[PDB]
Amino acid sequence: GMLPRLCCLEKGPNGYGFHLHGEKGKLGQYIRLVEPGSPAEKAGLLAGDRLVEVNGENVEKETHQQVVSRIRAALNAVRLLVVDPETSTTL
Ligand SMILES: [Cl-]
């Protein structure tokens, strides 16, 4: 598996500046819409990142709502372990 990567975000006055987005039924939570100039951008989060841990807790087997709660629970910073999306494919 692709080496996961740690991103350490510091919460700003409007939060972190990303969307957390899941799928229909197929399990995973993904980062989308990393806002320009945001704490998420500065921490190196990328659209399409799959979220594996929040503050050291594996969240691969938690619901969307639970993962949101884990991120919001953190008072002013959050550590996100992600797996980055593929960038090379042979056709
Ligand atoms: Cl990914």
Swiss-Prot record:
Protein name per its UniProtKB record: Na(+)/H(+) exchange regulatory cofactor NHE-RF1
Part of the intact protein present: 11 to 94 of 358
Compartmental location: Cytoplasm; Apical cell membrane; Endomembrane system; Cell projection, Filopodium
Disulfide bonds: none
GO BP term (any one): cerebrospinal fluid circulation
Disease implicated: Nephrolithiasis/osteoporosis, hypophosphatemic, 2: A disease characterized by decreased renal phosphate absorption, renal phosphate wasting, hypophosphatemia, hyperphosphaturia, hypercalciuria, nephrolithiasis and osteoporosis.
Induction: By estrogen.
Species of origin: Homo sapiens
Cited function: Scaffold protein that connects plasma membrane proteins with members of the ezrin/moesin/radixin family and thereby helps to link them to the actin cytoskeleton and to regulate their surface expression. Necessary for recycling of internalized ADRB2. Was first known to play a role in the regulation of the activity and subcellular location of SLC9A3. Necessary for cAMP-mediated phosphorylation and inhibition of SLC9A3. May enhance Wnt signaling. May participate in HTR4 targeting to microvilli. Involved in the regulation of phosphate reabsorption in the renal proximal tubules.
Domain of life of the organism encoding this protein: Eukaryota
GO CC annotations on file: actin cytoskeleton; apical plasma membrane; brush border membrane; cell periphery; cytoplasm; endomembrane system; extracellular exosome; filopodium
Single GO MF descriptor: protein-membrane adaptor activity
Tissue: Detected in liver, kidney, pancreas, prostate, spleen, small intestine and placenta, in particular in the syncytiotrophoblast.
Oligomeric and partner information: Homodimer, and heterodimer with NHERF2. Binds the N-termini of EZR, RDX and MSN. Binds the C-termini of PDGFRA, PDGFRB, ADRB2, NOS2 and CFTR. Binds ARHGAP17, EPI64, RACK1, OPRK1, GNAQ, CTNNB1 and PLCB3. Binds PDZK1. Interacts with CLCN3. Binds the C-terminus of PAG1. In resting T-cells, part of a PAG1-NHERF1-MSN complex which is disrupted upon TCR activation. Forms a complex with CFTR and SLC4A7. Forms a complex with SLC4A7 and ATP6V1B1. Interacts with TRPC4 (via the PDZ-binding domain). Directly interacts with HTR4.
Keywords, ordered alphabetically: Acetylation, Cell membrane, Cell projection, Cytoplasm, Disease variant, Membrane, Osteoporosis, Phosphoprotein, Repeat, Wnt signaling pathway
Domain PDZ, chain residue ranges per copy: 6-86
Modified how: Phosphorylated on serine residues.
Location of Phosphoserine modifications: 38
